[PDB]
Amino acid sequence: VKPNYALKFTLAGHTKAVSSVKFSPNGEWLASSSADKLIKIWGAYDGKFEKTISGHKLGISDVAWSSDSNLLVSASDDKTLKIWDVSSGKCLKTLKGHSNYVFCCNFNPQSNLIVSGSFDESVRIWDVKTGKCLKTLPAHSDPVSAVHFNRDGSLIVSSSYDGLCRIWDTASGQCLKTLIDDDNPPVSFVKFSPNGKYILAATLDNTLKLWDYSKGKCLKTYTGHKNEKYCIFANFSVTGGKWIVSGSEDNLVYIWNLQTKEIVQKLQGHTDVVISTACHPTENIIASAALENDKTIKLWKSDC
Amino acid sequence: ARTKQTAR
């Protein structure tokens, strides 16, 4: 009925606002990125700092894991992405081609492609093996806030400040669907649901919306949190109860019942905007991260 | 970029 997430750890070390946290697919690690130009790796279960990965020339807005938990990709204001070997900490490839800040990134499930979005208003698809850009998509008319592959990597969803969410065919780079809203608020985040049938989109009017993109039908809206300014991550929690999880500009983590849309828990502890949250792949664990008055990551655990 | 306000 309701989860009971409780604070287990506070992870300090970043020296500027944290931007993104992601659990490894194997559940062992959390990676974080920051405006401080660093990636840090932490133990998912004991919160123990593992290592710092450095090399970007400017701040990092996003980080993502490969399926074998062996590679990370990061998206930086330095206009590049970097692919890293997590075990050695070494930069394997630098992905060059965007003409402005790279804001978001993700591997496909196969882990042979990376998708990125940029302030340059494009979405790029990259070959992991060669580090070469395969496709540049003239995707949006304003900064691209999020990019995400579906369950089998055949589709990409992108969101933008231009007010659109778009679905793309990975192989051809073609736009298959545009989702619109008459009042046209900036879209600050999007991702596919775990089954790939829906997308969850955040807009800067304090609203999260679950869409059946095929039908162009909005099925659920989640409200009551604060999101008017930042590109805050949201998540489907599937390990126990079925929840939607998001950060908020009132310094809380919000958790909603997926079906009823009721807020079922608010997690208190951060002292600045909660810009990023992540849900552990097998356990009822949430990671949350906050902006520069706080600069910490918190790990929370629930029984359901 | 993400940690700063950049949207309309």
Interchain CB distance below 8 Å, A143 and B8 = no
Q: B6: which DSSP letter?
A: -
- Name the helix (H) or strand (E) containing B4: none
List all residues of chain B from 1 to 8 with a beta carbon under 8 Å from chain A: 1-3, 5-8
Q: Find, among A48, A46, A107, the residue nearest to A73 by Cα.
A: A107
Task: Specify the resolution in Å.
Answer: 1.5
User: What counts of helices (H) and strands (E) characterise chain B?
Assistant: 0, 0
A146 vs A187: CA distance, rounded Å: 9
Place of tokens 């097998």: A282
Interchain CB distance below 8 Å, B3 and A188 = no
What's the N-to-C CA distance of chain B in angstroms? 15
Interchain CB distance below 8 Å, A229 and B7 = yes
Residues 6 or more apart whose Cβ sits within 8 Å of residue A225: A206, A208, A246, A248, A249, A250, A252, A254
Q: Determine which of B2, B5, B6, B8 to mutate to test the interface with A (most A C-beta atoms within 10 Å).
A: B2
Interchain CB distance below 8 Å, B2 and A103 = yes
Domains of chain A: 1-304 (2.130.10.10)
Tell me how close the Cα of B3 comes to any Cα of chain A, in angstroms: 6
Q: Find, among A279, A294, A275, the residue nearest to A60 by Cα.
A: A275
Which residues share a beta bridge with A64?
A: A73
Residues 6 or more apart whose Cβ sits within 8 Å of residue A223: A206, A207, A208, A261
SS (H, E, C) chain A: CCCCCEEEEEECCCCCCEEEEEECCCCCEEEEEECCCCEEEEECCCCCEEEEECCCCCCEEEEEECCCCCEEEEEECCCEEEEEECCCCEEEEEEECCCCCEEEEEECCCCCEEEEEECCCCEEEEECCCCCEEEEECCCCCCEEEEEECCCCCEEEEEECCCCEEEEECCCCCEEEEECCCCCCCEEEEEECCCCCCEEEEECCCEEEEEECCCCEEEEEEECCCCCCCCCCEEEECCCCCEEEECCCCCCEEEEECCCCCEEEEECCCCCCEEEEEECCCCCEEEEEECCCCCCEEEEECCC
CA A174, A179, A180, A186 torsion: positive or negative?
negative
A123-160 CB burial, b ≥16 within 10 A, e <16: bbbbebeebebebebebbebbbbbbbbbeebebbbbbb
A297 vs A34: CA distance, rounded Å: 11
Place of tokens 């990597």: A153
List C-alpha distances in Å: A259 to A107, A264, A280: 29, 12, 21
The pair of structure tokens assigned to A107 is 């591997």
Question: Amino acid letter at A123?
Answer: V
* 3-class secondary-structure state, position B7: coil
